[PDB]
Design a protein around this ligand. Structure first.
Ligand SMILES: CN(C)/C=C\C(=O)c1ccc2[nH]c3ncc(-c4ccc(N5CCN(C)CC5)cc4)cc3c2c1
Length: 275
């Protein structure tokens, strides 16, 4: 990978439309786009990171990983231009889309989100890339409705490679938080936690545990209980992703196979979500 392949977009062809989250803007180049901005008030490390992020995303070619449209790095502030994901982050989506008595989502919808991200993770694994921060917050949706596609969006944590209290320990396997060891099997564990996040409809993992308690709990063999109404076949995938020894955890080909089996079982997909 070289900056050579990074398409530089003349800054004069780029217009910011609105803020989206604290930052990312909606933009136009008339091609609509997410614009990730590098602060002008940024460290020297921050700059090389920003460039790293663009190279990293630009080398992937997969439906379930956000596309990089280009960069505008010869002007300040520096921009990466990314696929615009109208549905927003998966965590907010699950929270906002929770069925309420005055009311959307079904089990098959959740399974399709899970499948989409697993497919993205399988691509990363077969290309020897370790994401290191698979979590609902880092996944994006093309749109809110039935045609939605989930994609992996945030390639910042992989690019970092901070402090103790900034580690996403609720998403990390023991060898990651104890030893700083990261493999393909790290992302498998994280995927298990993301699954829980999906089937809980956007709850925080280990509800009412702090980071240090989770660390002690997980190290001791403790695992989350199933999310409310979670089908058994789905919970079983989660508990396999959370095997204590990485070699006992499934790869993403196996995970994808198991998710696909779930989508074929009427007893799974006819399960109602809690209201
Ligand atoms: C979140 N994240 C993962 C951050 C860094 C990234 O790496 C990244 C990369 C490419 C992206 N493309 C996008 N296209 C739309 C959005 C977006 C759209 C709408 C919202 N909303 C609606 C309702 N919501 C509750 C409040 C605002 C939020 C985000 C984000 C990205 C994006 C992020």
């Amino acid at each position: 990978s070289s900056i050579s392949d990074l398409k530089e977009v003349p800054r004069k062809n780029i217009t910011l439309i609105r803020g989206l989250g604290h930052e990312v803007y909606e933009g136009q180049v008339p091609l609509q786009v997410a614009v990730k901005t590098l602060p002008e008030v940024c460290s020297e490390q921050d700059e090389l990171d920003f460039l790293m992020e663009a190279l990293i995303i630009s080398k992937f070619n997969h439906q379930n990983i956000v596309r990089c449209i280009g960069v505008s790095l010869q002007s300040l502030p520096r921009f990466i231009l990314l696929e615009l994901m109208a549905g927003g982050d998966l965590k907010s989506f699950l929270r906002e889309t929770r069925p309420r008595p005055s009311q959307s989502l079904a089990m098959l919808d959740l399974l399709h989100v899970a499948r989409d991200i697993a497919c993205g993770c399988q691509y990363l694994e077969e290309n020897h890339f370790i994401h290191r921060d698979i979590a609902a917050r880092n996944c994006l949706l093309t749109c809110p409705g039935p045609g939605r596609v989930a994609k992996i969006g945030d390639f910042g944590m992989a690019r970092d490679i901070g402090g103790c209290a900034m580690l996403p320990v609720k998403w990390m396997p023991p060898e990651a938080f104890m030893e700083g060891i990261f493999t393909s099997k790290t992302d498998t564990w994280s995927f298990g936690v993301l699954l829980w996040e999906i089937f809980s409809l956007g709850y925080m993992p280990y509800p009412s545990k702090s980071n240090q308690e989770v660390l002690e709990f997980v190290t001791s063999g403790g695992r989350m209980d199933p999310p409310k109404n979670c089908p058994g076949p789905v919970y079983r995938i989660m508990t396999q992703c959370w095997q204590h020894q990485p070699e006992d955890r499934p790869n993403f080909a196996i995970i994808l196979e198991r998710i696909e089996y779930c989508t074929q079982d009427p007893d799974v997909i006819n399960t109602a979500l809690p209201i």
